[PDB]
DNA sequence: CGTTTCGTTTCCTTGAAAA
DNA sequence: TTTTCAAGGAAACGAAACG
């Protein structure tokens, strides 16, 4: 077979110039065409079975001729599909996708373009042979021959409708006008009449022949091959139907022929719905006749768009729903069912900046919502009359297009929150922002007016952002859109940067910021604006006063822990971005406010926490102490160092830390959570770096002999923490305080381990020439960790391990002489997560063990349950 | 999914343990 | 260690809309 | 009838799992 040698490997070759040879030689040799025709199809199935000329010449006995080559494949072991895998993969199989999928399909698609030249199509009799052979070739149980036979049939069906429409519009309809000009008036040519009638008869009969072929293939091949068992065959049956429907509209564009799509809309296979929903939007491009299909299957489309098995089908389902809502086939009640899809129950499963699987879904839903927005926008203008004026001149576009947008998102939220269980507002804001991120490109030019809506000095009437609960959602939507505007696309971002930036000062001055729900999104927006996003606008003048307007609210209001209040994270991210600005005007403001807060704390400790007071309300004063002063300085010391003169520290570590036991009896389980020793480790880690900066003065000029006096504050801090830990070690274990007591001890141990690790890092990172500093460090520091605080550390390790085991229900093996009474452990409202806050403590303990600070029995006790608690613990054990 | 959390451990530790950018890059051993 | 499978980014081709 | 933008797909580099 020489034909397959010039077909499977030839890439850049002429397709039409090779068909004329066989078309003209079939009249010469009748048995040489079908032989090499059938062998070519058999080459792709993967077999050495061949058909001889005397076999293919038996046209009447087609079933037996195809069946005698069938046993040569059933009893054959080694066989692979050379065509299918080459189509699916180009770089994998030996055959590439080039010479076996492009020219291969072009050979059957352009097969009838050459038949009209040599007059072999109408002669006819050569056409019936293929209809006889391929009909019986495409009804077998083996999955090899059926696919290629049905595909060869559909490839000719592709060009059938093409040439039908071509002859209908460029031949018959064109000769009709010539025949119309040869009637009027009183002048028949007669010579040309008998030519016109013959040509028109040919054009009308060729269409009947083509329609007969089409009806044959639709009757015996299409009806039986859309219920097939294979997914690829069933999908290829529907793929090429789009061509026939797009081309020939007389015998295809009907209601009885569009029922197969609504049929296979809910198919058992997965790859069928994909092609179905990819083809469906092409039908609505053309447009009573088609409306009757959607009017009946739109509920099925809703089912597929919402609760489908596969995730890649809903995308194209909503793509169809896009044009559905465009043409108005969808009712107002059915829009709310798809609008709430912007709030899927999955919270951040993949990613956002990389445009993952969760991105395309929300993008398609926003594309759908845009059409509904525009529909209601254009429909509301004609129903109600427009007043002459508004704010300034006439804002006919954005005002109406945003005013209705407020109802849309809130109703979409309520429709999905009425069904699912109630969640807190913190879980609502995140989902609303995840949704509003993708709405940025669709309200990119109108958002200019949204800012002016927040300064509601002007008014407008409504026939038939006011209150605070509405302005909250207003701000959250706007500032979610702001953050989402930076990731997708280009050019649509810098315009908004230049437009919306200056109004931030007016936003702060107009809307009061007493509650934190007002402060959350306003400062969430500020994060996505850097130096280039503020200098290129020409409004770096207002940033100076913006920082002060934020500082006033930071100083006035009280800020609690991050577990209860949200202002903690807000101001933390704010200060971090302001520090990453790196501008000297901004640092001095925060430093001055640090000094002011330090003076306020000093005067607070002088009389409020004075040890000469008879007030037994430590529970009421400790909360105020940690909210008004301590947490603020702990947040500010993140990026702006804080220093404390030893007088304030010795009036603090005396009146507070060395006084906690005689206060703990009044403490409840909510005040104890607020207490965190993250500030006493800040004071050390800043005086442990301000001296590493002095080591950088060896290569300069101009020690002061304060090395003994230098370690005094840090030594006092570590000694007070050790004393507090050992004093909390002796406490009554009643059920009321057994949680707060252990939480306090855990926090103290965490801060102490941080301080000890930092000091032992500083001592080892020193060069060998600095001996007079090693002497002072080994003289002024008698103990880094007292041996009783080590027992307390072991107690906390135990406690956390036993809570982990109580959660995982696995018994713990430990030494005999031990407080085994704490194996059944109480409920704990301090530790929201017990897997993380336990492995963190384990990591800290292992880091201490590496520095030869803890004994070896400690290492033996720590690694006793390396097999019970999974591989994460053995990772710490070995590595 | 609950037992196998190897990559999450680094992120959780580096988040919960650190609250200052400058001292952490010099007081956190390798 | 090296492989293998999956996810990401960039470029190329085809199609869809407007002048 | 031609031009431009976008959308889908393929190639290539990278990451994570896996053996």
Residue numbers in the entry:
A (entry chain A): 135 to 257, 269 to 432, 441 to 617, 645 to 882, 885 to 1061
B (entry chain G): 357 to 386
Authors' text:
Cohesion is facilitated by cohesin, a member of the Structural Maintenance of Chromosomes (SMC) family of protein complexes, which is responsible for genome organisation across all domains of life. We show here that cohesin interacts directly with DNA through a complex formed by the HEAT-repeat subunit Scc3 and the kleisin subunit Scc1. In addition to providing a scaffold for the assembly of cohesin regulators and thereby participating in the maintenance of cohesion, the Scc3-Scc1 subcomplex also plays a key role in DNA substrate recognition and hence the efficient association of the cohesin holocomplex with chromatin.
Optimized crystals diffracted anisotropically to a minimum Bragg spacing of 3.6 Å in the best, and ~5.7 Å in the worst direction. As seen in other structures of Scc3, the protein is hook-shaped in the C-terminal section and contains an N-terminal ‘nose’ formed by a pair of extended antiparallel α-helices. Similarly to the interaction of human Scc1 with Scc3, the yeast Scc1 in our structure binds along the convex surface of the hook-shaped HEAT-repeat subunit. To identify amino acid residues potentially involved in DNA binding, we mapped the electrostatic surface potential onto the Scc3-Scc1 structure. This revealed that DNA is nested within an extended cradle spanning the majority of Scc3-Scc1, lined by a set of positively charged residues that directly contact the DNA phosphate backbone. We conclude that DNA binding by Scc3-Scc1 is essential for the stable association of cohesin complexes with chromosomes in vivo and hence an important determinant of cohesin function.
